[PDB]
């Protein structure tokens, strides 16, 4: 129950899965700058303002 059952969806075999999981991301095994740049979410919203639907390009 520790190794997963099959290969999950975005990957295709176990070399893909293990090459994903090969680097720990904690601040122990990695530096602070590489930590704080390795971890940040894909979206990142500012907390208290309305989000406009984007209208780009040529304003």
């Amino acid at each position: 129950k520790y190794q997963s059952s099959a290969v999950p969806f975005p990957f295709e075999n176990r070399e893909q899965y293990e090459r994903s999981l090969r680097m720990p991301i904690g601040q122990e095994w990695t530096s602070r700058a590489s930590h704080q740049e390795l971890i940040k979410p894909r979206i990142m919203t500012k907390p208290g303002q309305v989000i406009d639907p984007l209208k780009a390009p040529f304003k």
């Binding site: 720990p24 122990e28 930590h35 979206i43 989000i51």
Partner: protein, 460 residues
């Protein structure tokens, strides 16, 4: 012979004065830090357990609720903390969501209110002051559309014209409203779809294909000239107002309850129809509904996107709303409470943080979207920790007990029974289909996304 040892020296490591902070000297050696995988795996277990014990999503309702049951909800798309809300006894209100009470309320129409939106109108005889007062509008069952003012108190530029600045009159009933978010031109679904602006009391255009009513409609957020609608022909009809014409129609199996466009992709929308799944359609290729969000048990009443464009929210006729990621097709999270019932209109607040659910028992409620996060500013150690183990749960998502913990919710047992008997009959249909596929020559494979489409005008 040269001898040197460590020179620990007890000054760089313990501070000279009693206030400044000591070093934490630090060696990033894999030799030093022994178990990478097991340690951060257990940190992922602790993170999933912590979100399952911090998932407290219900914020609170707002006001004492309506009288008969919320059937229409419209956020305003240019301010955060207010939304309009109309219930089908006839009563429409303009809620302020900071203090959680209304600015004003009115007995709007005789019958049901069937649609309402908000507007930044432009009259040709006025600087329309869209900052000291705020305008909504509503179409209803008694063949009337009413454009309405609200004396709002958010600014203090001033120191009076409260309700019903003008009325539109239609020959048949009305069902839906939305407004072109420029040039004050809005559009109504009734027995036939009419396009009109706020400056003239007649429909500027008929727009329908033929004789079939228009159950809902919605404008676009960008390419604002384009819009979509859903008719009781079980049909999606896209209209373009530049050519002033309908432009394509597809017919599906069961009736589409409610459309909502994408704010980010701008040519993808979501239809919520009465078979128990929502359909993330494209626009340019309307023959393959490019995602199907499946996990419901009854008719899906409405849906809208998050403003961040990648997480949508469906509210359905079973007493439960649920929030989907865009690129999965199954429930990220289920919200339900015992007092909410037959939840009809769920919308997403304009900062992608709160989920407003207007039910049928009258109440309109607030929820958080990320049900485990909290809404205060965080010191950067908390921000780094929560973001860290968020990423950590994300990469250890497929371990078979992190998955069962992060997948475990508690659904009401009506939804539990309906979901499991839906599972056993779907397995039965799959088995009997497998038997026919074993024998018969050509029963061709149809995709799950292409299954529900029964037709499309303009094949190419």
């Amino acid at each position: 012979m040269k001898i040197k040892t460590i020179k620990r020296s007890a000054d760089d490591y313990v501070p000279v004065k009693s206030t400044q902070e000591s070093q934490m000297p630090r060696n990033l050696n894999p030799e030093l830090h022994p178990f990478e995988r097991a340690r951060e795996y257990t940190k992922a277990l602790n993170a999933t357990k912590l979100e399952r014990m911090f998932a407290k999503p219900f914020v609170g309702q707002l006001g004492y609720g309506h009288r008969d049951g919320v059937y229409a909800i419209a956020k305003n798309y240019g301010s955060l903390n207010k939304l309009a809300t109309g219930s089908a006894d006839g009563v429409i209100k303009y809620w302020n969501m900071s203090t959680r009470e209304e600015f004003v309320s009115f007995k709007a129409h005789y019958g049901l209110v069937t649609g309402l939106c908000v507007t930044q109108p432009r009259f040709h005889d006025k600087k329309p002051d869209l900052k000291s007062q705020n305008f909504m509008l509503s179409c209803s069952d008694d063949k009337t559309v009413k454009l309405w003012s609200i004396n709002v108190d958010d600014y203090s530029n001033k120191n009076n014209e409260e309700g019903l600045i003008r009325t539109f009159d239609g020959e048949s009933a009305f069902q839906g409203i939305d407004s072109h978010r420029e040039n004050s031109t809005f559009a109504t679904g009734g027995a036939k779809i009419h396009l009109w602006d706020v400056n003239r009391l007649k429909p500027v255009s008929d727009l329908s294909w033929g004789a079939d009513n228009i159950t809902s409609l919605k404008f676009n957020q960008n390419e604002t000239d384009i819009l979509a609608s859903t008719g009781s022909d079980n049909s999606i009809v896209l209209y373009d107002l530049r050519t002033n014409s309908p432009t394509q129609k597809i017919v599906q199996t069961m009736r589409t309850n409610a459309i909502c466009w994408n704010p980010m992709e701008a040519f993808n929308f979501v239809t919520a129809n009465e078979d128990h799944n929502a359909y993330y359609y494209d626009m340019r290729n309307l023959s393959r509904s490019l995602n199907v969000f499946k996990d419901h048990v009854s008719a899906v009443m409405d849906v809208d996107f998050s403003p961040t464009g990648d997480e949508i929210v469906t509210g359905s006729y079973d007493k439960s709303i649920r929030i989907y990621k865009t690129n999965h097709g199954h429930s990220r999270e289920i919200y339900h409470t015992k007092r909410m019932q037959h939840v009809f209109q769920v919308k997403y607040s304009m900062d992608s943080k709160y989920i407003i659910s207007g039910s049928d028992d009258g109440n309109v409620r607030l929820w958080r979207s990320k049900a485990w996060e909290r809404s205060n500013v965080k010191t950067t150690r908390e921000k780094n920790k929560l973001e860290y183990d968020e990423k950590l749960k994300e990469r250890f998502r497929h371990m078979p007990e992190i998955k069962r913990i992060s997948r475990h919710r508690h659904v009401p047992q009506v939804i539990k029974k309906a979901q499991e008997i839906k599972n056993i009959e779907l397995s039965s249909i799959k088995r009997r289909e497998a038997n026919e596929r074993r024998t018969r020559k050509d029963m061709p494979y149809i995709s799950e996304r292409k299954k529900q489409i029964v037709g499309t005008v303009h094949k190419y």
